[PDB]
Amino acid sequence: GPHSMRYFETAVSRPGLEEPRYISVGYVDNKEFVRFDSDAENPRYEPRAPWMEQEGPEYWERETQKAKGQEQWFRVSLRNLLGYYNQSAGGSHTLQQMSGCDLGSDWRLLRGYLQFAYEGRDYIALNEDLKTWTAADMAAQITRRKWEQSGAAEHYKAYLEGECVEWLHRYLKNGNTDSPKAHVTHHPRSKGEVTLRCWALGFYPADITLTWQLNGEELTQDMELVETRPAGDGTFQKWASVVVPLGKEQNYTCRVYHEGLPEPLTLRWEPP
Amino acid sequence: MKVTQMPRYLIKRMGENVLLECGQDMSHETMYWYRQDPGLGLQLIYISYDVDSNSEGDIPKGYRVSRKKREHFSLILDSAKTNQTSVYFCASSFGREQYFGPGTRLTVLEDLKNVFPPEVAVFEPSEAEISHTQKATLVCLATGFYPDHVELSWWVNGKEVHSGVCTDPQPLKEQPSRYALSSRLRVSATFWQNPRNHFRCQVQFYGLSENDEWTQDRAKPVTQIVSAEAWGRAD
Amino acid sequence: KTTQPDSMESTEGETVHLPCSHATISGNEYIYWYRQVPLQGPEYVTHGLQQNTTNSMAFLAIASDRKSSTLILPHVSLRDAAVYHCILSGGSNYKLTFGKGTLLTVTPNIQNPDPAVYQLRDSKSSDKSVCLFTDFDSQTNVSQSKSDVYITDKCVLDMRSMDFKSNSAVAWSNKSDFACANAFNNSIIPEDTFFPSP
């Protein structure tokens, strides 16, 4: 369908420890597949999906070298950022970067992404034209002038239309979704009331919608819910709950919408 | 965008220390030290990615660097060797191209006993050239200097000129050993014939400095400029 | 690594095409051109990634497979003579590796050659003598077969106030055997070279 590749990079400045803590995580279709961490005993890029383990040794060698390049790029950029914001002392200075490419059925680049944040706030982003920059404040405007002078955008556009799309293509043949499994549990409360908790487990990607209904109609009652959370095995969990009268709970239905399902589920708690 | 380097030429005795300095006031993050032997390529000695973030280039042996602020980058030779005689170029970059300084020519000598300043003579235009072409060529010879540390220029009525001038790109040896260098200045015959027009050949020689101890008997061949001059004349 | 021809010759006014081969280039590597007038600091000329590039001093064309390129110098002056270095430069990398490059010579357009050998007279001490071979077209000259006769290589001066360029070489010697008529015998000089009678 609409395939994608992302790399999520984080650098946290360090004092007289020269090198910042540098972490990079790569995703294919929103699923982790490679990882680099500078605080490893030997910092290396590593597979994080079984299907990446087939890549040749030179691939891991080339990638690890690029990570050491990034680490140095973030180190100098964090020193520059320190000066852009005058004093502003903190024991935490964080530069984050998101980049990657959305791939279409036609196999061309659909959307390219390159975005930076400093201290948890938008700093600078490449616009969708992959030629101009959006700068969030005075410091990011210094950076933008500098990158317009040196032609930085052309380097990033070339990666996004080229290498990014090309290796996304290859990964999608290497590892040639997972629909929710749902059920309802039943928790009696006091005074003739009971909680109906609709669970969705084992699904991927995280995006899901859970709704309780009475005969095709949504309930005016307020639905208690829980934010979608990782199970720890690559799948996610969610639940929505509702408080109904004891002896009436068979009439209520849970709906589960997820893209791994041709059609949304309908299920209920069935009494004996 | 300007990278600064001093001095342009330097004589050092074998075994002495050498400090070459590089400046750039645009506070670029990265700076470089290169050396170039004549007829060979530029080779990277050290690159500095930032203050106290220095990495060996291709030929680091016999050198070290210091980068305490972004605006300067220094190359240090702790004990000069004769085969460190070379031209040293420093550079800087912001991320686009590299900007190079004008370079420093270092000559490392076992002995200073063979260091000599130039003698400068001016040869006036021939009457035959004047009537045949209506132009007048002055020739300047700088002679007997060692090492090859000279900068020759022409001054007309007190102003430095580059038009109508050509200087030999290489000197030649007087015993193919002291060097000789020639330059020409060509003006119109009418300009030459005006007695109020003043011509000067100036050659700057980069020799020994004050703390350079001299033990020989003759005159210390210090850094100096040696000049020869002539007035136009209605012949 | 890049491959360039050793040298290239042109006359002033012509368009110059400097070729460069780089068949193991990668998608992140820029093509940079630097020039160096001998013993001077090298100077950026231009660069590009794929899209052709025009600036004030040069044009760059990059083949669509990116495996070769050419620098284009529109209307070369004498001041464009230099060694031209084509160098690959990783977009993420600050290092460059210079090669031998292409030595570009550019010879002047001599409109009215008046080849001649003149004797010049020292404006101080006398019996000091110099011979000036001048105003010849661009056909070369060589050293003497005598550490006794010192002969300069040819040298191009440019009188910018007029439109006038001229070649010259200088010769001198301490001998009294030395005379201006014999100074340049080891050269291939025009048969009509003017030798003023002393």
Binding site: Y7, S24, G26, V34, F36, Y45, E63, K66, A67, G69, Q70, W73, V76, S77, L78, N80, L81, L95, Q97, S99, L114, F116, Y123, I124, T143, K146, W147, S150, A152, H155, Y156, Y159, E163, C164, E166, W167 | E29, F94, G95, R96 | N28, G90, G91, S92, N93, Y94
Partner: peptide, 10 residues
């Protein structure tokens, strides 16, 4: 395949 940033820093 990871992106290596353009060498001009922030």
């Amino acid at each position: 395949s990871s992106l290596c940033n353009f060498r001009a820093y922030v």
